[PDB]
Paper text:
Betaglycan (BG) is a transmembrane co-receptor of the transforming growth factor-β (TGF-β) family of signaling ligands. It functions by enabling binding of the three TGF-β isoforms to their signaling receptors and is additionally required for inhibin A (InhA) activity. BG is nonetheless essential in vivo, where it binds and potentiates the activity of the three TGF-β isoforms (TGF-β1, -β2 and -β3) by presenting them to their signaling receptors, TGF-β receptor type I (TGFBR1) and TGF-β receptor type II (TGFBR2)4. BG, and a homologous co-receptor of the TGF-β family known as endoglin (ENG) which potentiates the function of BMP9 and BMP10, are transmembrane proteins with a large (approximately 760 amino acids) extracellular region comprised of two domains: the membrane-distal orphan domain and the juxtamembrane zona pellucida (ZP) domain19,20.
To decipher the direct potentiation mechanism, we analyzed the TGF-β1:BGO:(TGFBR2)2 complex by Cryo-EM where zfBGO was replaced with ratBGO. The strong preferential orientation observed previously was overcome using graphene oxide grids enabling building of a model into the 3.40 Å resolution Cryo-EM map. From the structure it was apparent that the most pronounced difference lay within the TGF-β binding loop of OD1, where there is a two-residue insertion in ratBGO compared to zfBGO that allows the BL in ratBGO to make additional contacts with TGFBR2. To test our model, we swapped the shortened loop from zfBGO into ratBGO. Despite similar binding affinity for TGF-β2, potentiation of TGFBR2 binding was not detected, showing that the extension in the binding loop is essential for potentiation. In the structure of the TGF-β2:ratBGO:(TGFBR2)2 complex, Y248 is predicted to be responsible for most of the contact with TGFBR2 residues F10, P11, L13 and I39. Indeed, mutation of ratBGO Y248A nearly eliminated the potentiation effect, in accordance with our model. This unexpected difference between zfBGO and ratBGO highlighted the importance of the BL of ratBGO not only for efficient binding to TGF-βs, and thus indirect potentiation of binding of the signaling receptors by increasing the local concentration, but also for direct potentiation of TGFBR2 binding. The structural and biophysical binding data demonstrate that the binding loop (BL) of ratBGO is not only the main structural element required for binding to the TGF-βs but also potentiates the binding of TGFBR2 through direct co-receptor–receptor contact. The potentiation is mediated by expanding the binding interface and increasing the affinity, not through allostery.
Residue numbers in the entry:
A (entry chain B), B (entry chain A): 1 to 112
C (entry chain C): 4 to 333
D (entry chain D): 10 to 116
E (entry chain E): 8 to 116
Write the structure that this text describes.
Amino acid sequence: ALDTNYCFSSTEKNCCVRQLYIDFRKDLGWKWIHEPKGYHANFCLGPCPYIWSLDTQYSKVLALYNQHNPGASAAPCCVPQALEPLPIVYYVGRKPKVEQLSNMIVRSCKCS
Amino acid sequence: ALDTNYCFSSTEKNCCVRQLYIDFRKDLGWKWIHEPKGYHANFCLGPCPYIWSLDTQYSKVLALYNQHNPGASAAPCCVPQALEPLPIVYYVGRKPKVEQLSNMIVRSCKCS
Amino acid sequence: CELSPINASHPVQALMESFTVLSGCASRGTTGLPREVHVLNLRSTDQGPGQRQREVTLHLNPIASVHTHHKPIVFLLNSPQPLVWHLKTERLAAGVPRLFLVSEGSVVQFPSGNFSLTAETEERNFPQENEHLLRWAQKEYGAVTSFTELKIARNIYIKVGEDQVFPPTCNIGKNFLSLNYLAEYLQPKAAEGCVLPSQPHEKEVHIIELITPSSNPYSAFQVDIIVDIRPAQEDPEVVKNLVLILKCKKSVNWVIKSFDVKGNLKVIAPNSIGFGKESERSMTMTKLVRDDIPSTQENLMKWALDNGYRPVTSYTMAPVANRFHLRLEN
Amino acid sequence: FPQLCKFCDVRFSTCDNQKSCMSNCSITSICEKPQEVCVAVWRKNDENITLETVCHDPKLPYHDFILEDAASPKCIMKEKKKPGETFFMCSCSSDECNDNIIFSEEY
Amino acid sequence: VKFPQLCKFCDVRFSTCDNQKSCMSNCSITSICEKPQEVCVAVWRKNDENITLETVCHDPKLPYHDFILEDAASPKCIMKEKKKPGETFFMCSCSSDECNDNIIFSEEY
């Protein structure tokens, strides 16, 4: 529901996907990747009020508890729901090859 | 492996399931539930470092990013993984009814 | 049972989906030029011409650094065989004129929309040699933004737009592969398996064991092992209860895709499990994770016996694969 | 939002000549239909003090007595004549509104 | 670590840094070696016509260009001159990841 389309379309203070550039060599330390040199791994961030994309019943219960107990520090978190693979090109010996590193790009977020 | 037994056995600074008591009337306002008047809805909490129970590949990528970039605010969050329904007894008119509210109790926590 | 080489009758095939180009070169020397040049040199085999698929499904996208591509593009679609190119464009700008210089006897089935409104297709007589074709393209249009020689595949993904990391001038080499311009090949890999003789049932248990998911010796990273679940025939449809027991010691991300099938589907695998988009979910898929699943042909049967996922319908062990296909007959 | 009410049968308490009391009912429940409202009946007599709180349709009568003021959102004890023992009745349409009985707002 | 080495794996290609103490291979290909036993090898050839630099994932046991390797354990590619007649020849080998990316002829400033 809270896909990249809606989050990038309009700024939302709540749980939404935000753009993030994961640079392989510079950040992850993975020197074995030839292409892409860095990809877009959106990260889920934002508070989850009770009136929002609540998925599980326990999520609703924790949201209600946070609403009625503001000084509790326990609340549902913003986490990826649908993640998409990243195709990369890496060299074995002198032969390049294409791998699909699954679950690397976040397409939507949820409150749980 | 971050079940109730592990976290309840001893303190664990990272992502763990922590004991929490939810009283329906006082906490959630659910005055429609007669029994139980309260239960134990544990909540997941604790930062997720690289060497921990990370489930998907995106979680490991985000953890590596946070490890190489401290001031980043992007990191996997501790979220419920195993949920158990709560047994409740509620009255409709003069008729008692026993129900199992799905996904009300947290037993294990993962990093996402 | 007994493990034997599998045939077409086996319920699980263990295809491998790979992306490869025979040779190629990407050049940035077309930023100054008004029109980009993408050249494809397709190659056929010695098989019968009738058996060769006449249809190609050239996919067009913009590169990852370009949200939408607005620039004239000339596509040189050269192949020693007459072809029909079922184009499929995504995130391409509208109203920019585009040119498709295809080989003689080849037709381009443009998709609907504005794209087909400003697209001119011309059939020509490109040489069947890489160097000659590249020279002809360079002479006609200065510099080629991309050139790729590849086998004739069902799907050919091209990502338009200039990347400045590419060399200034094209230089064809066998050991070149950029993820922009590539093809998609499905190679049926040999595997072992066995089917338990069972009466027709609404409950089916298929155990799939994978030894090596990918050829990279860095097998600490997940790979997508796409599982296709489609019937023997779309009509009549089949409603069933599937229990896929998937096992792979190396970390993978089993992705379950089901088409034209109804019923209840359960997946049990120690690794991650996923599902496709809403168009890919034909059954009520529910995932189930257990890290206790063993990794032998014998122990897996006992695990299914103990856990109640019985009777075991089929078992399939594939030493190397990543595109499992599941054909259900009726 | 179904209405919540106390559905205790006839009980015994010490509510007499008091401005307010508590039903002391341990049963909170949803009535069968949302149209129904919570009704409280007080019928203290020389035998003992009796009271009850149940669900009832606002337009239907209780013991052949019409609850004219059932449309009120709060349970206000109003006197009703009945042979044998004095009658007091109130009704309310909000959620869990019959837990506390208020005889009169005067304080 | 039993993981295969990361080595620059450009074949014979022309460079510009000649006789200088240190240089960068400028090889755009970083490859995981085919076999875990392999180590990175760099070969710098200088001729009166053209200068070339080659980088490979090579087995230390097998001699490259009929020349035996004596520095497979070196953390960095310590470049050593060889006695190929006519043309100037330098070779080095190392076992760190992307170690052949940087070539050092002398540690002195």
